[PDB]
Design a protein around this nucleic acid. Sequence first.
DNA 1: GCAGTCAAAATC
DNA 2: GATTTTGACTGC
Length: 64
Amino acid sequence: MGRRRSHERRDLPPNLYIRNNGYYCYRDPRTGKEFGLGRDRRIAITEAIQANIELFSGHKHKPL
DNA sequence: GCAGTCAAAATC
DNA sequence: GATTTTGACTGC
């Protein structure tokens, strides 16, 4: 794709990126657009991580 | 200089 | 069309 991995995304969860103004944002998988989360790193990241838990509700596939 | 959203490019 | 992460843009 255009951007696979970045330095800021190294500390961010999936569906969450940081802008140039130090503001984080959550991208929706329905359209790819997003909204401002928070200017804190552990805050915006923690928020996107929770949503990822629900988004990951489906994963168990007969693991061993 | 913050606050909040959509486009850019490249892939499958 | 989907995705994935960064860039640009507007308003005060």
